[PDB]
Design a protein around this nucleic acid. Structure first.
Ligand SMILES: [Mg+2]
Length: 691
RNA sequence: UUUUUUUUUUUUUU
């Protein structure tokens, strides 16, 4: 049986007296018998031995623990339940007046369900539901019971199918994808089609006549930012970042505000998008669509050709985007800088602005961005980007026809450098104005122990590396023989490995953090940062807009407690990471299906680790990690030797015929090999073998 | 309750 939880006051006293420790529970997915929490000082985490010591806690919960003598601790309370208490799993079935629900997530415990709650068709033939995904909600977990009690929510459908699995990911991670309540939709404008009131135009700087445009993916539905660039007579440039003024449409403390605060961010699945706001805002009103007057909150600079700021300006504005460019369009402009492109290979453009004018703007914005970026890395910036997958979906069926590695081009970077520049400018502005109430975004450095151990590992394999800083590492991960697919492959593998010690970036209230040296963003290597440029799809930006609004005197002094503001930040962090897991799982889902439907898929891969009966590989064409087992390979024998510091795996291939002699193949780390991905019998499961 | 330890990140647009 489990242990009885502690009292509210006993715990509150414990946390206050240091005797008890707070933290976020992490459960080992490979060995669910093991759970961990971070320690306030020591770089080594605290160990939770067994499920009993976990005390019915779940992964993600903010738990309280008491230390044990000879690290090791036991859970004694749960101050905040952060797990959704909802899971995707399968139903099956002595005291047989219950059913056994098995969550796909091994971190989640198995759940008892009352048979009376179960479908009649399941009662008759449970084996019919062997591959039927249900949603189950943990309603309780008794201290005497080994399993937890739950309520069957609904049937999603067959496992492995896209839409059922999608809803499973969304629900399991607590993403609200419901229609918006009527009390929310009444906060929206009621006079449609909505036009900007005349009195506002006077209050704002009217940029509707200026050449402003947007650059986003071809499939973009919610355009948050717009850009502009003029060359001044004195050789300098006037760049402008115009963000949709969502703050205007979302009154603080309204039903619309509360649901936005809850949803915290938009979720970008592969085939669809779970929006933060209603579509009337996300896609029509706030969205900076072309050839329509839009309310914006802008940042404008007078910039050096190198991107150095000469003077800086904030203020509410109003624009009329002359065109909606895609990154492909922008790139074509950049690659053909002195050629009038056929005006049919480009999107519709407002008649009051020529294509040549926009073309020139992109070229100039590229020129500065090119310089802004190059400078950023000289100043010790870290780009640690792994391979990302993009899919091509059959519009008839929705299934994926294929996939490709997403290419991050000059047009992509163009936008990035100015969104960066804008966000920093606002970070400095609100913090300089309201030092105790600034909604900023820091990024701590890597964990000392993990990184130090990784550097040691890299000392072997003949790969000395400097990691004294973010910048030092960045140069190391771009310091290769270059040119060839091997060094590029090794680059990607090392990019992965050095991501483990890295910590997540955090929203935070300025006044709630003492040491300002911790305000730093490790990877960007800057003293201050925040999110401001994407208020349609991110609530953190909305709060910053309200703060910036107050900094310019558009509203009263902010009367929010730093405590309250941190709560918003905490929740924003929670939904942000949760959103990332979902977006990743969505990609994983579609690739699994793609592997299943498009037969076996070939690809080159690089070895990451080597064990005595298997080895891990990074599949290059897809950026997935898979383990290859010697059992699955048609081998006649295989040997494992660890001499030479690094592990090596020697394979002997069994020929299919007596004519062919057995071929040998040594597998060591950073080895380039061919692999094929075949779908297994299980849903969304596929294996890797060495071709 | 998985064919051989938690930390897989950062940045930009969606
Ligand atoms: Mg945009």
């Amino acid at each position: 049986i489990f242990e009885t939880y502690m009292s509210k006051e006993d715990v509150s006293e414990g946390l206050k007296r240091g005797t008890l420790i707070q933290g976020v529970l992490r459960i080992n997915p490979k060995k669910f018998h093991e759970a961990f929490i971070p320690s306030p000082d020591g770089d080594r985490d605290i160990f939770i031995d067994g499920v009993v010591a976990r005390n019915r806690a779940l992964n993600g919960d903010l738990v309280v623990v008491k230390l044990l003598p000879e690290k090791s601790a036991k859970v004694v309370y749960i101050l905040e339940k952060k797990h959704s208490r909802a899971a995707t799993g399968i139903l099956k079935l002595l005291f047989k007046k219950y059913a056994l629900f098995s969550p796909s997530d091994h971190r989640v415990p198995r759940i008892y369900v009352p048979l009376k709650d179960c479908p009649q068709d399941f009662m008759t033939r449970p084996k019919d539901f062997a591959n039927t995904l249900f949603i189950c909600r943990i309603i309780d977990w008794k201290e005497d019971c080994n399993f937890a009690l739950g309520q069957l929510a609904k049937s999603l459908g067959q496992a492995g199918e896209i839409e059922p699995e999608t809803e499973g990911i969304l629900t399991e991670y607590g993403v609200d994808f419901s229609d918006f309540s009527s009390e929310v939709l009444e906060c929206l404008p009621q006079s449609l089609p909505w036009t900007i009131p005349p009195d506002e135009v006077g209050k704002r700087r009217d940029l509707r006549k200026d050449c402003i445009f947007t650059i986003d993916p071809s499939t973009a539905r919610d355009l948050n930012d717009a850009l502009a660039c003029r060359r001044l007579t004195d050789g300098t440039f006037e760049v402008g970042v115009h963000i949709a003024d969502v703050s205007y449409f979302v009154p603080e403390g309204s039903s619309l505000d509360k649901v936005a605060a809850e949803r915290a961010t938009s979720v970008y699945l592969v085939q669809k998008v779970v929006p933060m706001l209603p579509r009337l805002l996300c896609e029509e009103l706030c969205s900076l669509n072309p050839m329509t007057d839009k309310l914006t909150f802008s940042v404008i600079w007078k910039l050096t050709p190198e991107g150095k700021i000469l003077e800086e300006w904030f203020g509410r504005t109003i624009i009329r985007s002359c065109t909606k460019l895609s990154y492909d369009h922008a790139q074509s402009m950049i690659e053909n800088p002195t050629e009038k492109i056929p005006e049919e290979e480009l999107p519709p453009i407002s008649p009051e602005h020529s294509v040549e004018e926009v073309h020139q703007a992109v070229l100039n914005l590229h020129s500065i961005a090119k310089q802004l970026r190059r400078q950023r890395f000289v100043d010790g910036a870290l780009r640690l980007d792994q391979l990302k997958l993009a899919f091509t979906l059959d519009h008839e069926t929705g299934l994926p026809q294929g996939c490709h590695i997403y290419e991050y081009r000059d047009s992509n970077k163009l936008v990035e450098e100015f969104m960066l520049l804008a966000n920093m400018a606002v970070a400095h502005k609100i913090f300089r104005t309201f030092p105790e109430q600034a909604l900023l975004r820091r990024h701590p450095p890597p964990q000392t122990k993990m990184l130090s151990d990784l550097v040691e590992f890299c000392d072997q394999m003949g790969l000395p590396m400097d990691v004294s800083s973010a910048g030092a590492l960045n140069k190391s991960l771009t310091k290769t023989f270059g040119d060839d697919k091997y060094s590029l492959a090794r680059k990607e593998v090392l990019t992965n490995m050095y991501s483990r010690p890295m910590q997540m970036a955090l929203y935070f209230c300025s006044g709630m953090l003492q040491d300002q040296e911790q305000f730093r963003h490790y990877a960007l290597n800057v003293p201050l940062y925040t999110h401001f440029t994407s208020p349609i799809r991110r609530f953190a930006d909305v709060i910053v807009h309200r703060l910036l609004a107050a900094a310019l005197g558009y509203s009263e002094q902010p009367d929010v407690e730093p405590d309250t503001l941190q709560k918003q930040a905490d929740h924003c962090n929670d939904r942000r990471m949760a959103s990332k897991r979902v977006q990743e799982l969505s990609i994983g889902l579609f690739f699994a299906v793609l592997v299943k439907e498009s037969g076996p898929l070939e690809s080159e891969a690089m070895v990451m680790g080597v064990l005595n009966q298997a080895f891990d590989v990074l599949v290059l064409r897809f950026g997935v990690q898979k383990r290859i087992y010697c059992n699955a390979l048609a081998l006649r024998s295989y040997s494992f030797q660890k001499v030479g510091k690094k592990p090596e795996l020697t394979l002997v291939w069994e020929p299919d015929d007596l004519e062919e002699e057995p071929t040998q193949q040594v597998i060591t780390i950073f080895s380039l090999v061919d692999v094929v991905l075949q779908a297994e019998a299980t849903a969304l499961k596929y294996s890797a073998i060495l071709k």
